[PDB]
Design a protein around this ligand. Structure first.
Ligand SMILES: *[C@@H]1O[C@H](CO)[C@@H](O[C@@H]2O[C@H](CO)[C@@H](O[C@@H]3O[C@H](CO[C@H]4O[C@H](CO[C@H]5O[C@H](CO)[C@@H](O)[C@H](O)[C@@H]5O[C@H]5O[C@H](CO)[C@@H](O)[C@H](O)[C@@H]5O)[C@@H](O)[C@H](O[C@H]5O[C@H](CO)[C@@H](O)[C@H](O)[C@@H]5O)[C@@H]4O)[C@@H](O)[C@H](O[C@H]4O[C@H](CO)[C@@H](O)[C@H](O)[C@@H]4O[C@H]4O[C@H](CO)[C@@H](O)[C@H](O)[C@@H]4O[C@H]4O[C@H](CO)[C@@H](O)[C@H](O)[C@@H]4O)[C@@H]3O)[C@H](O)[C@H]2NC(C)=O)[C@H](O)[C@H]1NC(C)=O
Ligand SMILES: *[C@@H]1O[C@H](CO)[C@@H](O[C@@H]2O[C@H](CO)[C@@H](O)[C@H](O)[C@H]2NC(C)=O)[C@H](O)[C@H]1NC(C)=O
Ligand SMILES: CN1C(=O)CN=C(c2ccccc2)c2cc(Cl)ccc21
Ligand SMILES: CN1C(=O)CN=C(c2ccccc2)c2cc(Cl)ccc21
Ligand SMILES: CN1C(=O)CN=C(c2ccccc2)c2cc(Cl)ccc21
Lengths: 80, 40, 102, 51, 106, 333
């Protein structure tokens, strides 16, 4: 995601405000970042209880694409 | 990692201490830096 | 923005502002191609330069600029903070996962 | 690490390959080749996930 | 409205001694501060036009010193003809003058 | 007025195609410079920018008038109507005068025929930089000039006693360099058209290692210490140490490549290539040492036990000794 962003930035001029494509990249980065943090949280409480860990894992497996689709529809309906 | 399997209590203590000393120190650095470079 | 006379010394050609010095250099409203800075105002002055051929009138104009931080925040200061946070998230993984934290 | 590094290499190849030609709004034949290759790499990782 | 504050409001001085007058501006006035001298029942006469430039017909004992906001007028060998009022005025904007300093002899 | 009749009487029967004393003696030209700024010294194209006020003075016995005025002070309108020497800069790649808002030239003729001609120039001069010892290097590269068509027997140049004057030296565009001084030179060079009097001004520059420091010297050393931290990691976690070493190798390569784009495509080794090369070697040696460690814990453990403890003290001392010898050897030169 960082590689993707770096390649795009060199083309555009040094403007202070946030573009729409930069907003989308920040959304995708926040999603993959929270995925890594969710793994860190599941790994922190893995030896203590496996029930809560498995519950958080199967909750992530259903609620990350739904929230991503919500963000995608809000984005493609506000910027069109 | 070097202190595990020889003194596990010390490794646990320094990982719990560095679990709270790092965000505090980074926040203090952020406050001091932005304060000294926004009021300049 | 310093301008003066070439070839005509102070005893030959002198310059002056046609209106009040605060009102002589006029910047237009829609006249700003700045992306990275912010024009705050203008400032004129008048003086004399001492050259090898005589003294010359020099009219000075200063434009005051302030750099906008909005680009450099998103370019460097927010990724640095996020990378430091990504380093600090390694402290929460278990001590039995050595390649992970490595 | 196989799957993720080949997906990274495909991403780098796609960005580094689309800068040669101008910024046309339609798909070329290199874009179709890159898209099908990216689909194959991503499909390999998804099959590993299923296995 | 650029306000010029002149100090002191009143001063006394003898003959043959150095004297220093000061003028301070609220806003920026580049080098467009002028010093006028006014004897009683007379019109003011320009002494120093601009910061540190003597007018034609002024003796070489008056000399000015300029900056962005702080301005000075110094007289050297003071004779008995410097018993007058002295005004500082800015010309960067619409002109405003100072209050004046009345030199007296004691 | 009177200046109009003087100027009209000076230009009757005047030939601007012939130098003064065309068959009598060579013309003596006194030259002055005023360096306004020395621009960026980029080493890629082996050049540097300079802005000067070039002043020439000579004697023209045809521009001699009798009047109560002593000097005619003119614009650039009359520069093309009298004889002007054909001075050109021999080591310039591109050079232009200034034309905004009116041609920045000055002509002054005196009572006895002495002409002074001044003009503002911006030169993009050429100097081959021997880029050894980079970035701890010092250069002295010139600005030369002479006449183009008139040889030594026709035009002779000569410095004054107050020839070259620099300005403030703080508003100059020297980012990576530092002005230290100058010296003038006069010589005669043989050319296919004749012998020409050439005058040179050498500017001495020294490179300040403040950008290359925080760009390469600090990060490469930090990456070396990063490779060093692998020794304190447990010898059983094999993917950890292998990944650390090879990713450290990645960082070294990327930093080396991004660091070599400052200097030109020279074929010799500099004082900057050697440093990054030795840093790469150090990272290479650390990884190959762990490789031999992992082979030797399986082959025979008596040799592989105290090898890592030896490496923990041998790698920093070797790097510190390299740094001491490198820095003294390249700061003595
Ligand atoms: C291949 O083809 C190329 C394209 O044709 C060709 O390039 C051209 O070369 C010729 C010859 O070298 C150039 O001609 C001269 O230009 C000199 C000034 O030059 C520079 O400026 C021009 C633009 O010209 C304008 O601006 C100046 C300064 O303001 C004016 O003085 C000019 O008149 C002219 O002004 C018009 O346009 C302005 C807008 O630009 C308007 O604002 C203005 O009002 C006018 O409308 C640039 O193009 C040049 O750029 C080039 O060259 C440099 C060289 O290093 C390059 O680095 C750069 O990249 C460009 O390539 C450059 O910036 C003129 O001064 C000069 O005129 C004089 O001399 C001749 C010969 O003696 C006279 O016949 C002529 O009358 C001129 O003389 C008078 O004025 C001078 C002023 O110094 C006096 O000293 C002199 O005494 C005389 O005064 C007399 O007349 C006055 C009225 O004119 C009067 O008042 C006086 O009282 C007195 O009577 C000449 O025109 C030409 O510009 C080049 N053009 C281009 C596009 O490059 C190239 O050479 C060819 N190569 C080969 C190998 O063949
Ligand atoms: C520039 O050149 C002049 C002459 O070419 C140099 O001048 C001389 O200075 C020495 C003392 O330093 C005198 O003894 C000579 O008599 C001077 N020459 C003349 C002709 O008067 C001058 O030093 C040079 N400037 C430099 C090298 O910076
Ligand atoms: C002090 N000085 C010189 O002696 C060289 N000639 C002068 C000058 C020459 C001609 C007209 C006006 C001014 C000049 C111009 C600059 Cl932009 C900076 C320093 C400087
Ligand atoms: C400005 N910004 C952030 O603050 C979040 N972290 C960064 C980052 C982190 C490391 C290197 C480069 C960039 C990032 C990545 C994307 Cl794809 C979009 C916005 C964005
Ligand atoms: C492309 N490259 C690397 O990958 C890292 N090591 C090399 C090298 C390493 C050892 C010996 C010779 C050359 C090097 C050196 C320079 Cl001065 C610039 C880029 C660069």
């Amino acid at each position: 995601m960082t590689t993707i962003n770096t390649h795009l930035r060199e083309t555009l001029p040094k403007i202070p405000y946030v573009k729409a494509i930069d907003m989308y990249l920040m959304g995708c980065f926040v999603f993959v970042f929270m995925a890594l943090l969710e793994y860190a949280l599941v790994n922190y409480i893995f030896f203590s209880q496996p029930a809560r860990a498995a519950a958080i894992d199967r909750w992530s497996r259903i609620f990350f694409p739904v929230v991503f689709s919500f963000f995608n529809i809000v984005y493609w309906l506000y910027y069109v | 990692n070097y202190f595990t399997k020889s003194q596990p209590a010390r490794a646990a203590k320094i990982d719990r201490l560095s679990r709270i000393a790092f965000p505090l120190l980074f926040g203090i650095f952020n406050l001091v830096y932005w304060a000294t470079y926004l009021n300049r | 923005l310093k301008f003066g006379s070439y070839a005509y010394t102070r005893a030959e050609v002198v310059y002056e502002w046609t209106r009040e010095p605060a009102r002589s250099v006029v910047v237009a409203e829609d006249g700003s191609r700045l992306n990275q800075y912010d024009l705050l105002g203008q400032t004129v002055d008048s003086g004399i330069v001492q050259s090898s051929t005589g003294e010359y009138v020099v009219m000075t104009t200063h434009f005051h600029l302030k750099r906008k931080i909005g680009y450099f925040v998103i370019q460097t200061y927010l990724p640095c903070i996020m990378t430091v946070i990504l380093s600090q998230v390694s402290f929460w993984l278990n001590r039995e996962s050595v390649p992970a934290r490595t | 690490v196989f799957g993720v590094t080949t997906v990274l290499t495909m991403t780098t190849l796609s960005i580094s390959a689309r800068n040669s030609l101008p910024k046309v709004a339609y798909a070329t034949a290199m874009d179709w080749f890159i898209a099908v290759c990216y689909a194959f790499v991503f499909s390999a990782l998804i099959e590993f996930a299923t296995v | 409205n650029i306000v010029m504050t002149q100090s002191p409001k009143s001063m006394s001085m003898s003959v043959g001694e150095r004297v220093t007058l000061s003028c301070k501006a609220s806003e920026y006035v580049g080098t467009y501060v002028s010093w006028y001298q006014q004897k009683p029942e007379q019109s003011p006469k320009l002494l120093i036009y601009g910061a540190s430039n003597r007018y034609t017909g002024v003796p070489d004992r008056f000399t000015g010193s300029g900056s962005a906001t702080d301005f000075t007028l110094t007289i050297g060998s003071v004779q008995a003809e410097d018993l007058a009022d002295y005004h500082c005025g800015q010309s960067y904007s619409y002109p405003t003058f100072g209050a004046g300093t009345k030199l007296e002899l004691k | 007025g009177d200046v109009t009749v003087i100027l009209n009487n000076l230009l009757e029967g005047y030939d601007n195609k012939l130098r003064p004393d065309i068959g009598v003696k060579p013309t003596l030209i006194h030259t002055d410079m005023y360096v306004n700024s020395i621009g960026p010294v980029n080493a890629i194209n082996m050049e540097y920018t300079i802005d000067i006020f070039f002043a020439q003075t000579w004697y023209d016995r045809r521009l001699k008038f009798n009047s109560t005025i002593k000097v005619l002070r003119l614009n650039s309108n009359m520069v093309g109507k009298i004889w002007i020497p054909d001075t050109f800069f021999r080591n310039s790649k591109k050079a232009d005068a200034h034309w905004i808002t009116t041609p920045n030239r000055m002509l002054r003729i005196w009572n006895d025929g002495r002409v002074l001609y001044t003009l503002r120039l911006t030169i993009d001069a050429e100097c081959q930089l021997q880029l050894h010892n980079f970035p701890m290097d010092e250069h002295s590269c010139p600005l030369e000039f002479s006449s183009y068509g008139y040889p030594r027997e026709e035009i002779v140049y000569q410095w004054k006693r107050s020839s070259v004057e620099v300005g403030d030296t703080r508003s100059w565009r020297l980012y990576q360099f530092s002005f230290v001084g100058l010296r003038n030179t006069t010589e005669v060079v043989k050319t296919t058209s004749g012998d020409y009097v050439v005058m040179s001004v050498y500017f001495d520059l020294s490179r300040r290692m403040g950008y290359f420091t925080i760009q390469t010297y600090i990060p490469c050393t930090l990456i070396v210490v990063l490779s060093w931290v692998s020794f304190w990691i447990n010898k059983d976690a094999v993917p950890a140490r292998t990944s650390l070493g090879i990713t450290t190798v990645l960082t070294m390569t990327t930093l080396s490549t991004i660091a070599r784009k400052s200097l030109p495509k020279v074929s010799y080794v500099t004082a900057m290539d050697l440093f990054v090369s030795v840093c790469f070697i150090f990272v290479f040696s650390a990884l190959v040492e762990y490789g031999t460690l992992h082979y030797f814990v399986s082959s025979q453990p008596a040799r592989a036990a105290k090898m890592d403890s030896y490496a923990r003290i041998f790698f920093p001392t070797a790097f510190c000794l390299f740094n001491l010898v490198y820095w003294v050897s390249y700061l003595y030169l």
